[PDB]
Amino acid sequence: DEEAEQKLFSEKRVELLKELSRKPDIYERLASALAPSIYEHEDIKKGILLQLFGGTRKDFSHTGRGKFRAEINILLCGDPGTSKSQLLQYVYNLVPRGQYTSGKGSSAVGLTAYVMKDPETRQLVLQTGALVLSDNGICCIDEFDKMNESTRSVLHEVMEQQTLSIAKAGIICQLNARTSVLAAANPIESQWNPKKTTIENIQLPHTLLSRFDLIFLLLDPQDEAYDRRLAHHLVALYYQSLLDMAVLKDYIAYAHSTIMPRLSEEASQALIEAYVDMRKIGSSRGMVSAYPRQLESLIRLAEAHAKVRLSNKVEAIDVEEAKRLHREALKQSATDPRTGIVDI
DNA sequence: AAAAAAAAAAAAAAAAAAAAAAAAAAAAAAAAAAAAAAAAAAAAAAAAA
Ligand SMILES: Nc1ncnc2c1ncn2[C@@H]1O[C@H](COP(=O)(O)OP(=O)(O)OP(=O)(O)O)[C@@H](O)[C@H]1O
Ligand SMILES: [Mg+2]
């Protein structure tokens, strides 16, 4: 509602935002402002920032095609203790219109809608669930793997059609659910074992995986130096004693209100080439396969990156960053045709 | 060993008839009393050497 109303920013504030947009490291600087007390998950924070900006909302009514999913979906899969839940909790406590779910505490009707009695008018009233409450926001699903398949089947329609067609006795209707999904899962056997492929080790249906347009593998490199650095960060966090949030908030609201990035010609060609190369790279045995849904993924991420720069026009740097982020998540460089992830 | 199933199986809510319970509820007629008035019998005081 605030982004809707036109006098949210003074002119000098708009100039301040625009001057911020012109810095070379605005993407880095905005991503780093997220979760300031989480130590160097820079790419994850970039992806979450892109989720906050979102892709471009397009009207596909005349194409007779069905609504396009402009929201960005992220899976954080990694071995335990790697700060996934802290990121989901940070996002949950940051956005308006969010919901947080963990494990088996949610049922399918509890995620979509059900009928209760109004204990003040004794009328049966339909009441929404967690995925409709976070309609124009973000749903953070924690312990995504530890979630029974009856209630994850619900996520297919939400994550593709952005709608939720309940066909029950009382009323049948399509509830709109334009939520962005931020999920955290453990691998099969709740620890990456490096003798299994990515697919064998994530253990999620290829359809469900294709619905996520970033999969960050939060693997733990058995690394002395990184352990030392994170140890110092965590201990310093016990004796504690940037980019302001009041400008990050305004920057994001401005980007939502004014910027609607459109694909340019070089972006279009780069997207085509990126999709073809992505299919060749992921067509291997145990790697995460690419589908046309991943080309739509790339379009979304590129539009989000162009929204970060207040670009209002997607060109080749945005597509390059989308492809780079899609590679870095999933550790495409550290896999191989004999699928399996190396220690860097 | 876990992963879908595929039932119990419990609750809340609904119905859904029963079968019991609960809630509404002045005016019309009569009689008796106490008072009158009236026909009859009865009991008074004026008449006279
Ligand atoms: N950059 C970091 N990497 C790993 N751990 C961190 C980092 N920063 C902080 N931590 C600490 O590590 C702990 C990780 O707990 P958290 O619940 O986030 O783990 P998780 O990966 O989300 O859960 P799971 O064990 O189910 O995968 C947190 O308490 C946090 O304080
Ligand atoms: Mg956790």
Side-chain angles (χ1 to χ4, degrees), chain A residues 4-294:
Chain A
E5 61 86 19
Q6 199 53 40
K7 283 310 292 294
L8 186 67
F9 308 116
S10 61
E11 294 293 328
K12 64 182 181 293
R13 194 74 164 150
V14 175
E15 291 311 313
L16 182 62
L17 299 183
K18 288 187 155 200
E19 183 178 2
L20 267 178
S21 75
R22 288 175 210 120
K23 291 177 177 293
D25 58 327
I26 181 60
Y27 179 40
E28 275 78 20
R29 183 177 292 172
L30 288 178
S32 51
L34 288 182
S37 61
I38 278 163
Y39 178 64
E40 72 172 5
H41 276 302
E42 284 105 346
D43 283 317
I44 296 155
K45 286 182 183 188
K46 277 164 180 167
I48 282 166
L49 179 86
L50 296 197
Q51 199 171 30
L52 296 184
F53 277 87
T56 307
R57 275 69 174 174
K58 289 176 260 265
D59 200 74
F60 278 164
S61 305
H62 301 331
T63 55
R65 179 262 181 212
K67 295 180 176 67
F68 180 62
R69 209 273 304 285
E71 281 77 14
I72 289 165
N73 289 350
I74 286 146
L75 182 67
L76 311 173
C77 186
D79 53 36
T82 42
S83 166
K84 311 190 290 294
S85 315
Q86 290 301 331
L87 286 154
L88 266 65
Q89 275 290 331
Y90 176 80
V91 170
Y92 171 59
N93 289 304
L94 162 75
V95 294
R97 299 196 61 87
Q99 290 294 116
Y100 178 86
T101 290
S102 193
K104 283 165 180 288
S106 53
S107 80
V109 307
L111 282 178
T112 69
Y114 50 86
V115 180
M116 294 183 286
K117 198 154 60 69
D118 209 53
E120 49 268 5
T121 68
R122 76 278 190 190
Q123 295 289 289
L124 288 192
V125 290
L126 186 81
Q127 190 274 331
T128 60
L131 280 184
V132 190
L133 285 176
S134 54
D135 175 28
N136 273 109
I138 305 194
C139 199
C140 308
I141 296 95
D142 221 340
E143 316 285 22
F144 193 56
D145 55 313
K146 284 168 261 303
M147 183 177 177
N148 60 77
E149 268 294 334
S150 86
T151 179
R152 282 191 307 198
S153 70
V154 161
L155 278 168
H156 283 223
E157 201 185 354
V158 159
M159 278 165 102
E160 184 66 26
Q161 330 294 334
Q162 300 288 249
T163 194
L164 186 62
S165 313
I166 60 169
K168 292 297 155 47
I171 295 91
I172 63 170
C173 60
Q174 292 171 317
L175 299 187
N176 45 5
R178 280 80 62 95
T179 184
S180 305
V181 166
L182 178 68
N186 287 122
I188 205 61
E189 72 190 4
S190 72
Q191 197 197 355
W192 203 267
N193 67 325
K195 294 181 176 67
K196 295 194 165 174
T197 64
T198 313
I199 299 299
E200 184 172 359
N201 200 357
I202 288 175
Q203 189 80 4
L204 283 168
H206 284 78
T207 63
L208 198 67
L209 276 192
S210 66
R211 260 67 176 268
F212 282 108
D213 64 74
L214 284 176
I215 295 92
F216 293 92
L217 299 195
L218 282 73
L219 298 201
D220 167 38
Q222 321 294 148
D223 188 6
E224 188 79 2
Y226 174 78
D227 280 342
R228 190 162 284 104
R229 299 201 314 273
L230 178 62
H232 286 311
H233 174 97
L234 279 178
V235 173
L237 196 67
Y238 265 68
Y239 53 73
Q240 59 90 28
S241 196
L242 73 165
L243 190 49
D244 196 16
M245 183 177 176
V247 301
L248 162 76
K249 171 182 187 170
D250 291 340
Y251 195 98
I252 297 189
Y254 185 73
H256 287 169
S257 314
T258 66
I259 313 303
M260 283 73 74
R262 306 284 266 111
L263 285 175
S264 57
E265 180 63 27
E266 66 179 1
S268 307
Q269 280 311 314
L271 283 168
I272 296 180
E273 288 303 324
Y275 171 69
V276 165
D277 300 14
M278 183 174 36
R279 289 273 274 177
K280 291 192 291 162
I281 288 295
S283 82
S284 89
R285 173 77 276 148
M287 293 177 70
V288 185
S289 199
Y291 303 110
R293 190 174 291 123
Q294 315 324 311

Side-chain angles (χ1 to χ4, degrees), chain A residues 295-311:
Chain A
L295 168 69
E296 296 177 344
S297 171
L298 283 181
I299 290 156
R300 268 179 222 110
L301 297 153
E303 288 170 331
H305 190 246
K307 219 184 281 199
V308 173
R309 317 184 289 106
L310 312 186
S311 162

